[PDB]
Amino acid sequence: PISPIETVPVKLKPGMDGPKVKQWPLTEEKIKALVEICTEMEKEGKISKIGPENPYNTPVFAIKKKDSTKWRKLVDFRELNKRTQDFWEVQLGIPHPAGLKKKKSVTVLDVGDAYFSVPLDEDFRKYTAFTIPSINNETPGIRYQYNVLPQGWKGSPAIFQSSMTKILEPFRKQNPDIVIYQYMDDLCVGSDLEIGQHRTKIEELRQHLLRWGLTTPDKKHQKEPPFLWMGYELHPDKWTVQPIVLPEKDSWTVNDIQKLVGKLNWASQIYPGIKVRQLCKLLRGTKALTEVIPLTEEAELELAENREILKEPVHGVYYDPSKDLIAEIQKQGQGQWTYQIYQEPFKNLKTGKYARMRGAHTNDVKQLTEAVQKITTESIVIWGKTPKFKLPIQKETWETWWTEYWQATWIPEWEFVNTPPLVKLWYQLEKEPIVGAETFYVDGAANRETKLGKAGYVTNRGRQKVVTLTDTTNQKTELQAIYLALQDSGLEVNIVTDSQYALGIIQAQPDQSESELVNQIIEQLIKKEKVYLAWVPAH
């Protein structure tokens, strides 16, 4: 077919040379094959049989696919590629159902060998030259080169696209009420017209493209709704989730339990209640992939439980610009959050959860805020707007924390919602020393080399204690001094320390960490009715 298309000016990376690789010799069966095809393409205007005036070459292979078992060629550009200049990023940001505006009707157009339809920068082809061997290194084979965007070449995806774009500018402006999407070879075209009007419009587009050389596939290959898009069945009224099969065997290898759990984790984003704690558990200390691990009862149970959930239909609605955008968030567990964005109650546009964001040390409100922003960024991309928030937290809780935290933070417009568990402040150090409460003067000391230390305090009330800690860091002790303190005090304590680390706990009053220690202290802190932390320089 080819085209009357303005080619794109392509160049080789900064000061390099085109690929110079020797043609892997082949069988007579693969040759007679390759020669066959290269005759067709040759005449389809795609490739040009050039002469020995070309030092550049690429390896032409020959495989048999299923759809025919007829010989199919293959050129290895791994080299032309790495020597090919760089292009701007080929749309790696792909559409998401939840962001599609529902349409009266939507066509999907296979743009066929769109690739081989676009001309190549003539001032470039040479680098595409490859050679059809002779019967096992005989005389000279047959030399060729491409005239069009080659399959497997680095810039083809990018160049093809741009072309299509320039070509769509017109038809598109000629009827601003028809939305079109380009990707791979899929030209999905929709609009809010009448099937006829619609049908008649596609035909206008197809002919238009055709006016350039872009031939669009049969009535045969023609795709029929719904459409599969990364595990999604899409009808232009709503979308269903392309069901996922959970294989059942009596022999599970590591490799499997992973592939398995893998898919499961992805299924958590849509299905409510999918857990894998026990399944992940089966990977502990495995010695190899093919290793067959027996499923525990737990593993068999949750695994069996999940089977049902997936055996449930989770449909979907499309994006209606005329309706609000709402996002609701739940705290499935500490650090674990789930969200669902919808315009109409129960008609969810999108859902998802974020694997527990464990960290060095944060608090819920913090974490919530992060979930909030992760969502927001998502939203912008999907709908070009941020949603209204329904958050499991009281405005008072929010004001108190935020209006006082050492870090710039914020949550776009929201509304409280009482979908317990609610997120709250497990505790709040006193703004001032407690009058009455006992006062502990703690101190922790250890040899960092011997890792041996002591820890303790001495209250104003005469109380006192100390402990021998074998194998420890100086920190652990200090904090341990602090720990004991909270253990041995009443429900109101005044504690002073020179540990600059506690000073951190003051400024951020975190409610979760990594070290059981801190953790323990938190559990303690949470328990008291009033705690006043005080730091003072050491020595």
Partner 1 sequence: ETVPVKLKPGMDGPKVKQWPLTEEKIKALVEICTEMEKEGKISKIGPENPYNTPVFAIKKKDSTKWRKLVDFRELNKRTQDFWGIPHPAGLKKKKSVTVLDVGDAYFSVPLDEDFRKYTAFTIPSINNETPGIRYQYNVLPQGWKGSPAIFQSSMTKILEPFRKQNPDIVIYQYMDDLCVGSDLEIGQHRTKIEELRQHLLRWYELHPDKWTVQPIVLPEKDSWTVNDIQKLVGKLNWASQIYPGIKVRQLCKLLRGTKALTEVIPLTEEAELELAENREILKEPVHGVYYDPSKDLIAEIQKQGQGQWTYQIYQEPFKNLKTGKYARMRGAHTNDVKQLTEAVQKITTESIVIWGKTPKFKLPIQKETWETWWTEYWQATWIPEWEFVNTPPLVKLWYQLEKE
Ligand X SMILES: Cc1ccnc2c1NC(=O)c1cccnc1N2C1CC1
Is position 113 annotated in a ligand binding site? no
User: Cα–chain-centroid distance for residue 86?
Assistant: 24
* Partner from partner 1, ligand X, none binding residue 346, C-beta < 5-8 Å depending on class: none
Q: Does 155 bind partner 1 (CB under 8 A)?
A: yes
Please state the three-class secondary structure of 330-358 as a single string: EEEECCEEEEEEEEECCEEEEEEEECCCC
If residue 158 lies in a helix (H) or strand (E), which one and from where to where? helix 156-173
Task: Tell me which of 71, 87, 171, 416 binds partner 1, using CB under 8 A.
Answer: 87
Q: Does 414 bind partner 1 (CB under 8 A)?
A: no
Closest CA to 206 of 330, 128, 108: 108
Closest CB 90 distance from ligand X, rounded Å: 16
List Cβ neighbours of 502 (8 Å cut-off, separation of 6 or more).
478, 479, 482, 533, 535
Q: Rounded to whole angstroms, how far apart are CA atoms 93 and 84?
A: 23
Number of residues in contact with ligand X under rule CB under 6 A: 15
Q: Does 383 bind ligand X (CB under 6 A)?
A: no
Q: Does 236 bind ligand X (CB under 6 A)?
A: yes
Q: Rounded to whole angstroms, how far apart are CA atoms 445 and 497?
A: 12
Q: Which residues pair with 503 in a beta bridge?
A: none
Q: Does 48 bind partner 1 (CB under 8 A)?
A: no
* Partner from ligand X, partner 1, none binding residue 422, C-beta < 5-8 Å depending on class: none
Is the bond preceding 421 in cis, omega lying within 30 degrees of 0? yes
Closest CB 324 distance from partner 1, rounded Å: 15
Is position 256 annotated in a ligand binding site? no
Q: How many residues are present in the chain?
A: 539
User: Cα–chain-centroid distance for residue 167?
Assistant: 32
Residue number, 12 or 193, with CB nearest to ligand X: 193
DSSP characters for 286-302? ---TT-B----HHHHHH
Residue number, 276 or 479, with CB nearest to partner 1: 479
Q: Which stretch binds ligand X (CB under 6 A): 98-106, 253-261, 306-314, 440-448?
A: 98-106
Question: For the CA atoms of 42, 45, 51, 54, what is the dihedral angle to 10 degrees?
Answer: -110
Task: Tell me which of 370, 488, 492, 523 binds partner 1, using CB under 8 A.
Answer: 370
Q: Does 341 bind partner 1 (CB under 8 A)?
A: no
Task: Enumerate residues 188-227 that contact ligand X by CB under 6 A.
Answer: 188-190, 227
* Partner from ligand X, partner 1, none binding residue 118, C-beta < 5-8 Å depending on class: none
Q: Rounded to whole angstroms, how far apart are CA atoms 330 and 394?
A: 14
Is position 185 annotated in a ligand binding site? yes
Residue number, 103 or 125, with CB nearest to ligand X: 103
What mask, x for binding ligand X by CB under 6 A, covers residues 311 to 330? Answer: -------x------------
Task: Tell me which of 105, 107, 494, 513 binds partner 1, using CB under 8 A.
Answer: 494
List Cβ neighbours of 91 (8 Å cut-off, separation of 6 or more).
161, 183
Q: Does 85 bind partner 1 (CB under 8 A)?
A: yes
Task: Enumerate residues 392-411 that contact partner 1 by CB under 8 A.
Answer: 402-410
Q: Does 335 bind ligand X (CB under 6 A)?
A: no
Q: Rounded to whole angstroms, how far apart are CA atoms 499 and 309?
A: 50
Other C-beta atoms closer than 10 Å to the C-beta of 71 total 17
Q: Does 428 bind partner 1 (CB under 8 A)?
A: no
Q: Are 508 and 406 within 8 A, CB to CB?
A: yes
Task: Tell me which of 36, 86, 298, 471 binds partner 1, using CB under 8 A.
Answer: 86
Tokens 């006992």 map to which residue? 438
List Cβ neighbours of 363 (8 Å cut-off, separation of 6 or more).
401, 425, 426, 508, 509, 510, 511, 512
Binding residues: 110, 185-186, 443, 478, 498
Instruction: Detail the residues annotated as belonging to a binding site for Mg(2+).
Output: 110, 185-186, 443, 478, 498
**Residues found near partner 1 in the complex (CB under 8 A):** 8-11, 85-89, 91, 93-96, 99-100, 155, 158-159, 161-162, 165, 179, 181-182, 369-370, 373-374, 376-377, 380-385, 402-410, 432-435, 439, 441, 458-460, 494, 496, 500, 503-504, 506-507, 532, 534-537
- Residues found near ligand X in the complex (CB under 6 A): 95, 100, 102-103, 106, 179, 181, 188-190, 227, 229, 234, 236, 318
